Ligand binder design. Structure first.
Ligand code: IMV
Ligand code: IMV
Ligand code: IMV
Ligand code: IMV
Lengths: 149, 149
């Protein structure tokens, strides 16, 4: 569980928001890109894996699952690339709910920045610090630390 | 403190590499930018603070210390902005040594990517996973987890 991440792609203002969620904690990382390509997805995973111990990634769709560039980045970074098929049917709605919540937070900060990418990073901050009573940021560190010890 | 980070700026291939180092662990995050502006530095800190519990940032120079954009981002993110003056004289050489090591790693991966930004992220990965026997990635998580508990 502590090394499992899920990729997610959502759209806003004619742009793409690429999201990685740490499944056990709800912690997220996100970036804005013009469009979802293998190359952008590969780069995003390289960034992620340098920052957290990414063991397994459930890809967000078949194109990223198939992409040789993505497969190469996963090989390079020591990541097991898997499908994101909701074998547990709960996963479709959970991703839906996350995107809705993320977009809500983005709406709450949107006027504090000119560029969407900035609003997205503010939303990542707010999401990861929100107390649920631990935050997602606290949960991910605790989960991984316990795994190391 | 577990919340203390140091900003660092170095140059390669006519571009700027902006680095944040977690002082207690040696863990790093980095990005390539065309040039170091207040705006780029502010954005980098917003990204960092959404991902790790950043309490204090020692800025890399007086322009970023002075920048109203940087000060605004620090206020927004709940970061105490401080100078980076080596009151301990050892800090100048330690940063120097880090940049030299980072550039060495970049050289070792440079031919595996077209774009410098990609090589920099590969170097971040290698640095953060390198054992010596825990890695920087392991140390940062352990330090912060202990702080939470
Ligand atoms: O509000 C949300 O649903 C939400 C989540 C939910 N999340 C978890 O806690 C565990 C998990 C696994 C897979 C997908 C999502 C989740 C996570 C991040 C969010 C959420 O709203 C905004 O950012
Ligand atoms: O060439 C780039 O800079 C680049 C790459 C390169 N690349 C692959 O095609 C497969 C791979 C595995 C590990 C590391 C790098 C690569 C991939 C994605 C990129 C690249 O520039 C921006 O986004
Ligand atoms: O406007 C942007 O998108 C942007 C900003 C905006 N900004 C400030 O000027 C001060 C501040 C504090 C907290 C959040 C945002 C801002 C800053 C940096 C940027 C921005 O676009 C890219 O880099
Ligand atoms: O080789 C390096 O010096 C290096 C460091 C050093 N580092 C720590 O271990 C603790 C610390 C506090 C303040 C500044 C630097 C450090 C860190 C990161 C690196 C280093 O080489 C490449 O990436």
């Amino acid at each position: 569980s502590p090394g499992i991440w899920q990729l997610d792609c959502t759209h806003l203002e004619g742009k793409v928001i690429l999201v990685a969620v740490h499944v056990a904690s709800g912690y997220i990382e996100a970036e804005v890109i013009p469009a979802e390509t293998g190359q952008e997805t590969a780069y995003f995973l390289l960034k992620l894996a340098g920052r957290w111990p990414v063991k397994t990634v459930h890809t967000d769709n078949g194109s990223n699952f198939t992409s040789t560039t993505v497969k190469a980045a996963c090989w390079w970074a020591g990541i097991k690339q898997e499908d994101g098929i909701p074998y547990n049917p709960q996963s479709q709605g959970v991703i839906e709910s996350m995107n809705k919540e993320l977009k809500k937070i983005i709406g709450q900060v949107r006027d504090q920045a000119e560029h969407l990418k900035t609003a997205v990073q503010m939303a990542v901050f707010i999401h990861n610090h929100k107390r649920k009573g631990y935050s997602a940021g606290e949960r991910i560190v605790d989960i991984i630390a316990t795994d190391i010890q």
